[PDB]
Design a protein around this ligand. Structure first.
Ligand SMILES: Nc1ncnc2c1ncn2[C@@H]1O[C@H](CSCC[C@H](N)c2nnn[nH]2)[C@@H](O)[C@H]1O
Ligand SMILES: Nc1ncnc2c1ncn2[C@@H]1O[C@H](CSCC[C@H](N)c2nnn[nH]2)[C@@H](O)[C@H]1O
Lengths: 332, 333
């Protein structure tokens, strides 16, 4: 009934159990033979009696079940925490990796609601990307989480755009380069450049080199708030602007506008929504993460028009493809 | 499908959104006339744009709904966050009160799984009850949270025991006295004493006075690891032993055994799920809280027999209580 539902929604221990079990690679250990609690505790380096208590709640919430007496086995839902599942939900729930670590910022959500400012720095001592610049493991973990998709997640946006009159593509904060590579495979005449931060540029280079695309896709280390390294016919902003508050996003959009060739276009790859369609879990998860990690925000369809106009741009067309959008921006 | 379920179970922002809305008294402000985001931000002292983003997730999870354009209204489930609902779920999710504050100990759950030791102290600087002894606001909201049930939650365990041969009852760690009061109204010949800590003894005394029971129920400040202040025919341990690891629970149980009158009994009011029945959300919520708050634990039916034996006791009988709780009656072995 109504009481049961509210207790479940407000329960902080349940997602922490899911995250703890992910961090211990508990499902992997079961799958690699660790039948009993005794052997599971050995592999995860935990107290048997406490691990049982954890496992009890994992059975209660339907991630593990008991097969034979004392033998715990993942359910269909628990199997998604195997480290080799395509959705990478174990690493995304791993408290040592960048995202689940950043989610501890939600423990201070009232502060963000009162001020509109992110809470990450009050916990970890630096803002999100400064923290990542001083912690190579966090830098690398963040890039690998977002790029867990890379081989196929940019196939759809690359197909949604006519590359016939594109000669060079600049991917501004393009991660490990998977979007650039998707376009390259889709359009052999096109060349590309990825602009990224320290650390990320190295794994982007080796990923692109390992696709056999280093003849087609360059990587430049730099700062997207400074003049861009080069001009281009299509400039990519894929899950970049939501990281930034309005004024920084306009500056980023302004830098991209300065770097368009005649006829060029700015492409935004992001989750958006008509306002009255945005009261959904997918939108809020990303939007509220952006608030507490960085002070960024998801933007409704209506708000893209205004941000575009501040940058001297217009939204020319939107295409729906999670469920993502490709926004095509032209000079106003 | 399976992926959607796991993302929902792992989501940390959803309970923090619930807790934030509880702490801002948001549903209360809506119900007292705040019909816009603008008026709600005024009453909650928050940034309008950020409050809307919070509200968005509250609509997506079914606590709020949009009635008219811009007018957000609690659902049937959201109405349980009204401050005067009998289940007290707003204060139980209020991040300024003791329990939701303590729940932040779950952020370090792997440490407790690795060591078996609570994480509360590493976050707030002192163990649970030392923290509460130095924070009168936290002492008072913890007592008020557990006693939010007071008027009716002890009617069942008091009716599960025959008070015929009982003259005095000692309620060891008995909160604000709600249990002692239930017995008093159940059995007019009975006298009682509540043993509690500083702070709690004062609200226990005024609660009992305000029931008209100060003729029947005394309150004594002290420490139930020391010799108890008095002997009794029935000694109550209601939601006390789960706060403690085995060795500390044996000491408390031993202190009670030393204080029993001839023929006396120890009454344990708690859960007692058979191990095979304990893989359920009620058992695990309380058990995992005790782990990270205090290093205590819920005890299965099987484990009650072991702990009783360590204290020189036997579980004499068990009565399931209607509402799933139990009264366990312990006699000398
Ligand atoms: N000042 C700056 N100059 C250049 N790049 C930056 C930057 N600040 C952040 N970045 C990069 O912006 C990216 C945002 S994550 C999106 C990565 C990639 N575009 C993608 N698309 N879809 N999934 N992943 C991160 O990598 C950051 O390093
Ligand atoms: N050394 C000590 N000496 C005396 N009381 C203590 C104590 N340590 C903790 N307590 C008290 O033990 C209580 C546990 S909460 C249960 C309160 C009451 N028995 C009840 N039953 N059902 N709901 N509430 C708290 O109050 C504490 O102060």
């Amino acid at each position: 009934d109504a009481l049961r539902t509210l207790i479940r929604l407000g329960s902080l221990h349940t997602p922490m159990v899911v995250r703890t079990a992910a961090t211990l690679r508990l499902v992997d250990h079961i799958l690699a033979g660790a039948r009993t609690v005794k052997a599971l505790a050995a592999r995860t380096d935990t107290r048997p009696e406490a691990l049982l208590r954890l496992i009890r709640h994992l059975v209660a919430i339907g991630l593990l079940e008991e097969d034979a007496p004392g033998e715990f086995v993942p359910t269909e839902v628990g199997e998604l925490l195997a480290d080799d599942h395509p959705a990478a939900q174990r690493a995304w729930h791993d408290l040592t990796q960048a995202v689940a670590r950043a989610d501890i910022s939600f423990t201070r959500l009232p502060d963000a609601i009162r001020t509109g400012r992110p809470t990450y720095e009050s916990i970890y001592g630096k803002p999100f990307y400064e923290d990542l610049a001083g912690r190579p493991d966090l830098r690398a973990s963040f890039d690998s989480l977002l790029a867990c998709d890379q081989d196929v997640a940019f196939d759809a946006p690359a197909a949604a755009y006519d590359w016939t009159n594109v000669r060079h593509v600049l991917d501004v904060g393009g991660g490990k380069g998977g979007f650039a590579a998707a376009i390259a495979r889709r359009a052999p005449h096109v060349s590309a450049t990825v602009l990224e931060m320290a650390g990320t540029v190295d794994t982007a280079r080796s990923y692109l080199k390992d696709e056999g695309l280093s003849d087609r896709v360059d990587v430049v280390e730099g700062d997207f708030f400074e003049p861009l390294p080069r001009k281009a016919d299509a400039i990519i902003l894929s899950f970049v602007l939501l990281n930034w508050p309005d004024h920084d996003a306009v500056r980023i959009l302004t830098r991209c506008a300065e770097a368009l060739e005649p006829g060029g276009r700015i492409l935004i790859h992001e989750r958006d929504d008509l306002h009255e369609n945005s009261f959904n879990e997918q939108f809020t998860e990303l939007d509220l993460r952006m608030l507490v990690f960085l002070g960024g925000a998801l933007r409704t369809r209506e708000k893209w028009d205004g941000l575009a106009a501040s940058a001297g741009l217009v939204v020319e067309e939107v295409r729906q493809l999670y469920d993502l959008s490709l926004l095509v921006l032209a000079p106003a």
